[PDB]
Scaffold this motif. Structure first.
Motif, PDB file in Angstrom:
ATOM      1  N   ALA A   1       0.789  -1.242   0.000  1.00 33.62           N
ATOM      2  CA  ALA A   1       0.000   0.000   0.000  1.00 33.62           C
ATOM      3  C   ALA A   1       0.815   1.285   0.000  1.00 33.62           C
ATOM      4  O   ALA A   1       0.254   2.352  -0.297  1.00 33.62           O
ATOM      5  CB  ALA A   1      -1.003   0.022   1.164  1.00 33.62           C
ATOM      6  N   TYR A   2       2.107   1.195   0.345  1.00 33.45           N
ATOM      7  CA  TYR A   2       2.978   2.380   0.448  1.00 33.45           C
ATOM      8  C   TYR A   2       4.048   2.435  -0.639  1.00 33.45           C
ATOM      9  O   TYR A   2       4.662   1.411  -0.982  1.00 33.45           O
ATOM     10  CB  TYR A   2       3.657   2.458   1.833  1.00 33.45           C
ATOM     11  CG  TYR A   2       2.660   2.574   2.968  1.00 33.45           C
ATOM     12  CD1 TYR A   2       2.050   1.443   3.501  1.00 33.45           C
ATOM     13  CD2 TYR A   2       2.314   3.818   3.494  1.00 33.45           C
ATOM     14  CE1 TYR A   2       1.125   1.540   4.533  1.00 33.45           C
ATOM     15  CE2 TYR A   2       1.383   3.923   4.527  1.00 33.45           C
ATOM     16  CZ  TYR A   2       0.801   2.777   5.042  1.00 33.45           C
ATOM     17  OH  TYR A   2      -0.116   2.873   6.064  1.00 33.45           O
ATOM     18  N   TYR A   3       4.284   3.634  -1.169  1.00 32.72           N
ATOM     19  CA  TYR A   3       5.193   3.803  -2.302  1.00 32.72           C
ATOM     20  C   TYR A   3       6.026   5.063  -2.178  1.00 32.72           C
ATOM     21  O   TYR A   3       5.596   6.059  -1.579  1.00 32.72           O
ATOM     22  CB  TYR A   3       4.403   3.887  -3.609  1.00 32.72           C
ATOM     23  CG  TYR A   3       3.596   2.641  -3.911  1.00 32.72           C
ATOM     24  CD1 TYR A   3       2.388   2.396  -3.269  1.00 32.72           C
ATOM     25  CD2 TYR A   3       4.043   1.716  -4.845  1.00 32.72           C
ATOM     26  CE1 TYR A   3       1.656   1.256  -3.542  1.00 32.72           C
ATOM     27  CE2 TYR A   3       3.311   0.588  -5.128  1.00 32.72           C
ATOM     28  CZ  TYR A   3       2.129   0.362  -4.475  1.00 32.72           C
ATOM     29  OH  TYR A   3       1.426  -0.779  -4.762  1.00 32.72           O
ATOM     30  N   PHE A   4       7.220   5.017  -2.757  1.00 32.15           N
ATOM     31  CA  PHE A   4       7.966   6.228  -3.045  1.00 32.15           C
ATOM     32  C   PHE A   4       7.495   6.710  -4.403  1.00 32.15           C
ATOM     33  O   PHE A   4       7.162   5.889  -5.280  1.00 32.15           O
ATOM     34  CB  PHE A   4       9.466   5.936  -3.100  1.00 32.15           C
ATOM     35  CG  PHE A   4      10.037   5.513  -1.788  1.00 32.15           C
ATOM     36  CD1 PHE A   4      10.154   6.429  -0.750  1.00 32.15           C
ATOM     37  CD2 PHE A   4      10.448   4.203  -1.582  1.00 32.15           C
ATOM     38  CE1 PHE A   4      10.672   6.048   0.475  1.00 32.15           C
ATOM     39  CE2 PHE A   4      10.972   3.814  -0.357  1.00 32.15           C
ATOM     40  CZ  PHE A   4      11.083   4.739   0.672  1.00 32.15           C
ATOM     41  N   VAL A   5       7.468   8.031  -4.578  1.00 33.04           N
ATOM     42  CA  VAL A   5       7.100   8.641  -5.854  1.00 33.04           C
ATOM     43  C   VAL A   5       8.325   9.214  -6.550  1.00 33.04           C
ATOM     44  O   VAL A   5       9.000  10.118  -6.012  1.00 33.04           O
ATOM     45  CB  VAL A   5       6.022   9.739  -5.655  1.00 33.04           C
ATOM     46  CG1 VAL A   5       5.815  10.549  -6.932  1.00 33.04           C
ATOM     47  CG2 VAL A   5       4.707   9.112  -5.195  1.00 33.04           C
ATOM     48  N   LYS A   6       8.638   8.668  -7.732  1.00 33.20           N
ATOM     49  CA  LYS A   6       9.727   9.185  -8.558  1.00 33.20           C
ATOM     50  C   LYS A   6       9.129   9.673  -9.864  1.00 33.20           C
ATOM     51  O   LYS A   6       7.937   9.501 -10.092  1.00 33.20           O
ATOM     52  CB  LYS A   6      10.784   8.106  -8.828  1.00 33.20           C
ATOM     53  CG  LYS A   6      11.413   7.532  -7.569  1.00 33.20           C
ATOM     54  CD  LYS A   6      12.622   6.655  -7.887  1.00 33.20           C
ATOM     55  CE  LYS A   6      13.390   6.310  -6.618  1.00 33.20           C
ATOM     56  NZ  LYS A   6      14.444   5.274  -6.849  1.00 33.20           N
ATOM     57  N   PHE A   7       9.948  10.281 -10.717  1.00 34.94           N
ATOM     58  CA  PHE A   7       9.453  10.859 -11.968  1.00 34.94           C
ATOM     59  C   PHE A   7      10.120  10.245 -13.194  1.00 34.94           C
ATOM     60  O   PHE A   7      11.296   9.887 -13.144  1.00 34.94           O
ATOM     61  CB  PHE A   7       9.646  12.379 -11.968  1.00 34.94           C
ATOM     62  CG  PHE A   7       8.791  13.092 -10.964  1.00 34.94           C
ATOM     63  CD1 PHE A   7       9.212  13.238  -9.653  1.00 34.94           C
ATOM     64  CD2 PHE A   7       7.556  13.602 -11.330  1.00 34.94           C
ATOM     65  CE1 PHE A   7       8.417  13.885  -8.723  1.00 34.94           C
ATOM     66  CE2 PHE A   7       6.758  14.248 -10.409  1.00 34.94           C
ATOM     67  CZ  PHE A   7       7.188  14.390  -9.103  1.00 34.94           C
TER      68      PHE A   7
END
Ligand SMILES: [Zn+2]
Length: 369
Positions: free
Chosen positions: A94-100
């Motif tokens: 359910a948890y994530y790091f956000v990258k681009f």
């Protein structure tokens, strides 16, 4: 001598009636809330970074999470982020790091980057700064920003001495949903496979939310959020498209959910000073409810005349989740809301005992305060 409903309905119905009566005086509060929210949105839209911010529940500046707290509002401000790469945090599902997907300053979020990761901390910090400064342009109305408690209710505003507004910032992604949701939303036998496919074409949201263990947390995680889908399902909830649009098809699903929420709220209120119940929330009750809808997909299993048994069955399912320490997120089935890592056995057993007493005694807590 025909009964209007099977036995046990009347007390529950009188409760529901009382709860709605508490909403017959809202237009005011709702008005002040809308004014504040619109002001905020105007100011936030001027910031290069929040330029795309908007109401999630479009045309809806209110959404009461607590059935018994009519002066407490919950709004979500969503912001589209054109192309993110999620990276799951430590298999939490359910948890994530956000990258681009790309680097230069064309997404105005570059200022919030920490290395390659989008910092929920920094973004929240700017969001709150902008909001505080804006509510200070309110001259003839004390709008006060409450102190930080966490990340996802990001901001709580206290309007006059009666109204509170919890404001959640959410990233919006129009990519297909993460792989952890692949086996979730098991509505095929209830709302249809074609509906599930349609819903899963909608965007998903990410709200800043520290993923913590027994030790501590990684500050820059975001949790998946499908509150828009939950709302859609609750308001278009029958196997029949005309469920609740006529007298022959009146069901009690919504009322069962309201009653479960009120039961939890009353118990948490009774025990608030001893934190026994702090970790339980309306989200657990709503999740359990959706599972009961999956288990009972036909509208005839929710006939309004059977409110008493339908509610009893809801209570029983929630108890079963408590006892077995298992409540799967309805969208993310390997995310266990009731794991021992999130909620201690003692709290669950305590809640179990309170609910069992209530259910054995015709729910006196509904009347007590
Ligand atoms: Zn219905």
């Amino acid at each position: 001598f025909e009964l209007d409903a099977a036995p046990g309905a009347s007390k529950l119905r009188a409760v529901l009636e009382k709860l709605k009566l508490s909403r017959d005086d809202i237009s005011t509060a709702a008005g002040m809330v809308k004014g504040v929210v619109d002001h905020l949105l105007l100011r936030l839209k001027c910031d290069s970074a929040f330029r795309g911010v908007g109401l999630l529940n479009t045309g809806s500046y209110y959404e009461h999470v607590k059935i018994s707290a009519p002066n407490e509002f919950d709004v979500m401000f969503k912001l589209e982020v054109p192309r993110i790469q999620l990276e799951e945090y430590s298999n939490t599902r359910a948890y994530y790091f956000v990258k681009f997907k790309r680097n230069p300053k064309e997404n105005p979020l570059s200022q919030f980057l920490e290395g390659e990761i989008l910092s929920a901390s920094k973004m929240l910090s700017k969001f709150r700064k902008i909001i505080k400064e804006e509510i200070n342009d309110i001259k003839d109305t004390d709008v006060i920003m409450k102190r930080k408690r966490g990340g996802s209710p990001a901001v709580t505003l206290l309007i006059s001495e009666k109204i509170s507004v919890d404001i959640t910032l959410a990233l919006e992604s129009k990519s297909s949903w993460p792989a952890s949701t692949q086996e979730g939303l098991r509505i095929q036998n209830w709302l249809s496979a074609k509906v599930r496919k349609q819903l899963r074409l909608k965007p998903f949201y990410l709200v800043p939310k520290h993923a913590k263990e027994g030790n501590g947390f990684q500050e820059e995680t975001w949790r998946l959020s499908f509150s828009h889908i939950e709302k859609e399902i609750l308001n278009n909830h029958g196997k029949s498209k005309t469920c609740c649009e006529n007298k022959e098809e009146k069901c009690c699903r919504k009322d069962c959910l309201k009653l479960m929420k009120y039961l939890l709220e009353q118990l948490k209120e009774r025990f608030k000073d001893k934190k026994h119940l702090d970790k339980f929330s309306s989200y657990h009750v709503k999740t359990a409810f959706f599972h009961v809808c999956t288990q009972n997909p036909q509208d005839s299993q929710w006939d309004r005349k059977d409110l008493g048994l339908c509610f009893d069955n809801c209570v029983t399912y929630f108890l079963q989740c408590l006892r077995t320490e298992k409540l799967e997120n309805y969208f993310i089935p390997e995310f266990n809301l009731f794991s021992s890592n999130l909620i201690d056995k003692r709290s669950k057993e305590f809640l179990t005992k309170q609910i069992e007493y209530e259910r054995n005694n015709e729910f006196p807590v509904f009347d007590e305060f």
